[PDB]
Amino acid sequence: WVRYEASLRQLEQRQLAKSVVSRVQSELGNPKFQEKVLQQSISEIEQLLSK
Amino acid sequence: TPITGKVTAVIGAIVDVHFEQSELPAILNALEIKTPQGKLVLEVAQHLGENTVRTIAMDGTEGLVRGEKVLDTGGPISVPVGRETLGRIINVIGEPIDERGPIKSKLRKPIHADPPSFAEQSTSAEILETGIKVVDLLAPYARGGKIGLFGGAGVGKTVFIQELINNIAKAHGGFSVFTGVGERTREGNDLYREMKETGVINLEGESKVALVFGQMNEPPGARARVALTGLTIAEYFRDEEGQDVLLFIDNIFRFTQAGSEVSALLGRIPSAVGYQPTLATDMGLLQERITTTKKGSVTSVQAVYVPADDLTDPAPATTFAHLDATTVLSRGISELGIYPAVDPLDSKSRLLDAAVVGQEHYDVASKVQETLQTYKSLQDIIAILGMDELSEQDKLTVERARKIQRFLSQPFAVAEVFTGIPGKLVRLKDTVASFKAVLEGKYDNIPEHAFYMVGGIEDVVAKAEKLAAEAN
Amino acid sequence: PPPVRLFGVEGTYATALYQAAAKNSSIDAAFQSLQKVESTVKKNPKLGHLLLNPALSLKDRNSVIDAIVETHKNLDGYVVNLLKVLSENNRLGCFEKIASDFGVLNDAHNGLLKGTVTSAEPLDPKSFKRIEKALSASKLVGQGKSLKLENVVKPEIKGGLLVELGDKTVDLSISTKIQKLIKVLED
Amino acid sequence: KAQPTEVSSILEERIKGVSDEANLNETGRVLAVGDGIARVFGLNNIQAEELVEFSSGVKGMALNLEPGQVGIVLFGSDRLVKEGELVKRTGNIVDVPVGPGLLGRVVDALGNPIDGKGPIDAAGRSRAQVKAPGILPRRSVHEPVQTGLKAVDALVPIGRGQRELIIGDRQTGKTAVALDTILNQKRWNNGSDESKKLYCVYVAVGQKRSTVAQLVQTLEQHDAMKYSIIVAATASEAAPLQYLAPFTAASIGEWFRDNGKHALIVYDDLSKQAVAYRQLSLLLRRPPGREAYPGDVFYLHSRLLERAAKLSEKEGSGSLTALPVIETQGGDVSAYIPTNVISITDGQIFLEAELFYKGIRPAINVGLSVSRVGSAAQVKALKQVAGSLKLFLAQYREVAAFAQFGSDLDASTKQTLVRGERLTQLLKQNQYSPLATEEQVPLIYAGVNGHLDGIELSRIGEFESSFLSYLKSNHNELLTEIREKGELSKELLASLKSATESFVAT
Numbered sequence A: 001w002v003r004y005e006a007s008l009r010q011l012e013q014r015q016l017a018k019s020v021v022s023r024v025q026s027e028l029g030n031p032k033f034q035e036k037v038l039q040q041s042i043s044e045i046e047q048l049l050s051k
Numbered sequence B: 001t002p003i004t005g006k007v008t009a010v011i012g013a014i015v016d017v018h019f020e021q022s023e024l025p026a027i028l029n030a031l032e033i034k035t036p037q038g039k040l041v042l043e044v045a046q047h048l049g050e051n052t053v054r055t056i057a058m059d060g061t062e063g064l065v066r067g068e069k070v071l072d073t074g075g076p077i078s079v080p081v082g083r084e085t086l087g088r089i090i091n092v093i094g095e096p097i098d099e100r101g102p103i104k105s106k107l108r109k110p111i112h113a114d115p116p117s118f119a120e121q122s123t124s125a126e127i128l129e130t131g132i133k134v135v136d137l138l139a140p141y142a143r144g145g146k147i148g149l150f151g152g153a154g155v156g157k158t159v160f161i162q163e164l165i166n167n168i169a170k171a172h173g174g175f176s177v178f179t180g181v182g183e184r185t186r187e188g189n190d191l192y193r194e195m196k197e198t199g200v201i202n203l204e205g206e207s208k209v210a211l212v213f214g215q216m217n218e219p220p221g222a223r224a225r226v227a228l229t230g231l232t233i234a235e236y237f238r239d240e241e242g243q244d245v246l247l248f249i250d251n252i253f254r255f256t257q258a259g260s261e262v263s264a265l266l267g268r269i270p271s272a273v274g275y276q277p278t279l280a281t282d283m284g285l286l287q288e289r290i291t292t293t294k295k296g297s298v299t300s301v302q303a304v305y306v307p308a309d310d311l312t313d314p315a316p317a318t319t320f321a322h323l324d325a326t327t328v329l330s331r332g333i334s335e336l337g338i339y340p341a342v343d344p345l346d347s348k349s350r351l352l353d354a355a356v357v358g359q360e361h362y363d364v365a366s367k368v369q370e371t372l373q374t375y376k377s378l379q380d381i382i383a384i385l386g387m388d389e390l391s392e393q394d395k396l397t398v399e400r401a402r403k404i405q406r407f408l409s410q411p412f413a414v415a416e417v418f419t420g421i422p423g424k425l426v427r428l429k430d431t432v433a434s435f436k437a438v439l440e441g442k443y444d445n446i447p448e449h450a451f452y453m454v455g456g457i458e459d460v461v462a463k464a465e466k467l468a469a470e471a472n
Numbered sequence C: 001p002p003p004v005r006l007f008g009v010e011g012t013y014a015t016a017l018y019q020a021a022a023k024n025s026s027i028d029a030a031f032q033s034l035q036k037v038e039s040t041v042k043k044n045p046k047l048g049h050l051l052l053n054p055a056l057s058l059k060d061r062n063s064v065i066d067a068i069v070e071t072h073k074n075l076d077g078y079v080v081n082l083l084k085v086l087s088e089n090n091r092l093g094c095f096e097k098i099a100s101d102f103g104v105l106n107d108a109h110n111g112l113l114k115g116t117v118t119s120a121e122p123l124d125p126k127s128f129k130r131i132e133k134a135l136s137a138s139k140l141v142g143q144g145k146s147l148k149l150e151n152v153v154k155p156e157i158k159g160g161l162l163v164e165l166g167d168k169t170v171d172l173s174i175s176t177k178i179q180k181l182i183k184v185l186e187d
Numbered sequence D: 001k002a003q004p005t006e007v008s009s010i011l012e013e014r015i016k017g018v019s020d021e022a023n024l025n026e027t028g029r030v031l032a033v034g035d036g037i038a039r040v041f042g043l044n045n046i047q048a049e050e051l052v053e054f055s056s057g058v059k060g061m062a063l064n065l066e067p068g069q070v071g072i073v074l075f076g077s078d079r080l081v082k083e084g085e086l087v088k089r090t091g092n093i094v095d096v097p098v099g100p101g102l103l104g105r106v107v108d109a110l111g112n113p114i115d116g117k118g119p120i121d122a123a124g125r126s127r128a129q130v131k132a133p134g135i136l137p138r139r140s141v142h143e144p145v146q147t148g149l150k151a152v153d154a155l156v157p158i159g160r161g162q163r164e165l166i167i168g169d170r171q172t173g174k175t176a177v178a179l180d181t182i183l184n185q186k187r188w189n190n191g192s193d194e195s196k197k198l199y200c201v202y203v204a205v206g207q208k209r210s211t212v213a214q215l216v217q218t219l220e221q222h223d224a225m226k227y228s229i230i231v232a233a234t235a236s237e238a239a240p241l242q243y244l245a246p247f248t249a250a251s252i253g254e255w256f257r258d259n260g261k262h263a264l265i266v267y268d269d270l271s272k273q274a275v276a277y278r279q280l281s282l283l284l285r286r287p288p289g290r291e292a293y294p295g296d297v298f299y300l301h302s303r304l305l306e307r308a309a310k311l312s313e314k315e316g317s318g319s320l321t322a323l324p325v326i327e328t329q330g331g332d333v334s335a336y337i338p339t340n341v342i343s344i345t346d347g348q349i350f351l352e353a354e355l356f357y358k359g360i361r362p363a364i365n366v367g368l369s370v371s372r373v374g375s376a377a378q379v380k381a382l383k384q385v386a387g388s389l390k391l392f393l394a395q396y397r398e399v400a401a402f403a404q405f406g407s408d409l410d411a412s413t414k415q416t417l418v419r420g421e422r423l424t425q426l427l428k429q430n431q432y433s434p435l436a437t438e439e440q441v442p443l444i445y446a447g448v449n450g451h452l453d454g455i456e457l458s459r460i461g462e463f464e465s466s467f468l469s470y471l472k473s474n475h476n477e478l479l480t481e482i483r484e485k486g487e488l489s490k491e492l493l494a495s496l497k498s499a500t501e502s503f504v505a506t
């Protein structure tokens, strides 16, 4: 039973991986570029200023 | 203004440093780098050009970045010398391996010096009563000369070195220096503990031996240059102190192995069977720096690890010609039961002269060699043709040779736990008399096993009596 | 010491030329001469093939040199010497490379450090200006030098930027970040 | 689940902090790749043997630092990495997790958890390349290692801290004797005295994943996985993984050793490690030294096996017993790699193929198998009985060869020959059968003391079982006395003599 539960955890983990990659593919289609570009441009500006 | 350089290339144990000035350090100069864990020393090997030179790392190039500051000492690697080094473990860079504080040596001689000239060569034929039957019989050891202990892996080379140390250094009287070149650190620890127990090393008092360890865990440059460091210690002890130096260089073949090590990455074209092209020359200066001069003497005791028990390998073959006394520890005798394994034929010394060891000793040695050679020649005859299918004289010679080979076995005090018999010692005159009596056939009726693991002829007759009593 | 380290025979001549120009303090003249020579090479595509030819003889290489030298009547007092050194060393098939490393040496010392702001899409020019000022004001290889960042539209980046400047790139691309969570998700 | 979410959030916050801190502190552009070695530009001030992060995700490490280009060996498949990939450096020397959490866990060369049992909890990170302890930190090998083989491995022991070699051809029993030793260590690591526990660590380098899976299955079948680390690099991953896995196993071994604990490490089949280094050096622009092998193979074996040592009481009295394994071709112990490893070790254990095919499952040749702990670093009960039995057995072999050479006072008429043949037949063992030290003295004592003259070679196999049953059924007094004392005294010697000549009639 404990190894069956370990296999259950492993299959839950791989199903989570499939969900993550599916959501990544979904993000590859939706317009999610300009806002994040501005966000990490500000992040890199703050990184340069912090030093 | 100290000479400063910047590291450009780090290839394993090979480090390339460039100096932004015309003042380029000379070859063999010591280049120190301040590492977070301590100090790393580099020895210049070649001048590659463009104000860049090639160096050999004395320590592992841990965390070596390109452009790290390098400082040139100005001269070769200098190690502490004098009576202070006695009873102290000496590293390749001279730093005290032991944790008994620093070394307050008055001088720090460089490890790269010219060998003594031909004029200052005080050759001698003095005998050395080591206490081992075979070496005292067939290849007598020369006091103040160079000593060889050729042998393969697992043949007793380190055991023979330890036994020789125990036998001689205690009664040597003069100073000595043990030099570990590319050997196991555990064996060095055992040797250090044994000489501490026997009184040769006295931490709280006076010690007759200086310890230099370049153990086989260390980088190739350290293995190559520890022989030079110990040689410098021996040279200072011989010249300045004027004492008979009992130099015990352990695994001298590791020097040539490290030379080939650095040679592959130095750009040198490999020599035969992959050795370094400059093996002959560099080992020539190293070995010729050991010699008997007018100031004193260095009795170098070297053990050579022959690769694959192949005596035709260039390094042991040239060490044969670059050495006075040879003691080959053949594996074929080591596994035969006579673990002393000193092959009674290729183990030759220049002391085998009628005017040196005496006419009787020379005759005895020649006759025992004759008997053993008859045994080797008739090995196949006994093997498949048949021992009984042989002449009476040939059978008698074969039996005498077998008895002699069994007699060549001698228990060692350092190998008491190994052989299980106390390591008794035998004097040269006793060995000569016993072997002369044996060659006369006075002990033919005695079984061959009586000569097994015994010392003098008294031990032989005692073992014969005890086996007769126990067997009845 | 030359401003930057150059390696290989294609670049040893460049740093030698830079060292020679440093003695005469005529780095600008040598630079302009090299640009004129490579412009002449681009003017005649056959001439570029002439340079790259390794079988072309010593007299023919010398004739090519006099051809490229007689125009402009002299490129520079030293770069013609470098050209004839290349001829006697048979290195006319690398002159574009030597000019490349000499130019790299030029921006190394003249305060013209170059950067590669690579992105999946062409960089918006309003956002382009924001990148320039921040890195110029920052201390990343900053000792009073200008900056020449240029957008590098590549498909390897999923999105975002890799601000590259003097052996310094920031792992700010969103592609590397989404992958970095994947291995730990697969634990 | 709940843990992946918070773990991911924390680690990506740390990732953003790293990206926003000091840029990345150095980078590089890939110039070449292939066979697990990658050239890269940049990295002007990169540390030596330093881990590097690749954009694709493959790990790396710096064996070579040329002017301009940097020699990086690829830790994993080289398929992912391409030209122009940014190569971030981790800022530290190559490390591996070390600690008590690695017990019961299988990890790769880099120390990442590969068994899928969860994250690795390590007290710290130790460099894969660590200088071996010096002369004074090292201590003489005196504490025995219970091999549990009921063979020459007992009469000539291993002891705590020895690098006892296991030479022989493939499928001769090297892995077999290694696993028997690991299983036998359970009897001592299942207690509470940490001074006698031997926390094993396996190095399954150059081993197929099916074989290592069967090995770990056998380990946990005998409840041996609780104390054994299976840090290894299988044949699936790249050559640098194979090259580094034994060194990181050595790092774990020193962590156990530097903490005062005793650990047994078995470098299983270092030959693939040597040829993996060959693969690195061929395309890393290091010319080979001898016999197509780069010269530094001897040096790497030196640094890797000399780290295995017995620490002194000042350093914690820890032990790092090593069991190196080499796969020789055709029994050629005179080949290069043999010569170096036989010269790198403290004795060897020969396993010829002919003895395995003859029927002797241990298949160990007594004649050449030597060690530096003869009648030392043993229990004491076995060391007094057979402190010099190896030389006697070698002489028996020589005389038996001599006996067949010519018909003389030899063969069965030779007491030495009879004793040697009976002892050689005695020294046998079945796999997965760890035998304790207490049930080993009476057999060897009967062999050495000439009590097996009238037992016959064919009946010695039954005599072993009968004698062991005799002790474990109706003579457990002296057996338990030997086990608890760890030595046979005059009383114990007399009792064992009583038992042996009482049972000689049966």
Ligand SMILES: Nc1ncnc2c1ncn2[C@@H]1O[C@H](COP(=O)(O)OP(=O)(O)O)[C@@H](O)[C@H]1O
Residues within 6 Å of the ligand: B151, B152, B153, B154, B155, B156, B157, B158, B159, B160, B305, B339, B340, B410, B411, B412, B415, B418, B419, D342, D343, D347, D370, D371, D372, D373, D374, D391
């Ligand atoms: N007199 C002896 N009796 C029994 N065994 C010996 C004797 N001398 C040496 N040995 C064995 O030989 C081995 C020494 O091997 P050695 O030749 O020193 O190897 P290496 O030359 O590689 O150091 C020891 O392990 C020891 O067991």
Ligand SMILES: Nc1ncnc2c1ncn2[C@@H]1O[C@H](COP(=O)(O)OP(=O)(O)O)[C@@H](O)[C@H]1O
Residues within 6 Å of the ligand: D169, D170, D171, D172, D173, D174, D175, D176, D361, D362, D429, D430, D431
């Ligand atoms: N009593 C035994 N002792 C040792 N090995 C045995 C025994 N009985 C069977 N074997 C077989 O011997 C093999 C040992 O091979 P092994 O030594 O692991 O190969 P390698 O030397 O390549 O690692 C095992 O696969 C096993 O099936």
Ligand SMILES: [Mg+2]
Residues within 6 Å of the ligand: B157, B158, B183, B251, B303, B305
């Ligand atoms: Mg040796």
Ligand SMILES: [Mg+2]
Residues within 6 Å of the ligand: D175, D207
């Ligand atoms: Mg195996």
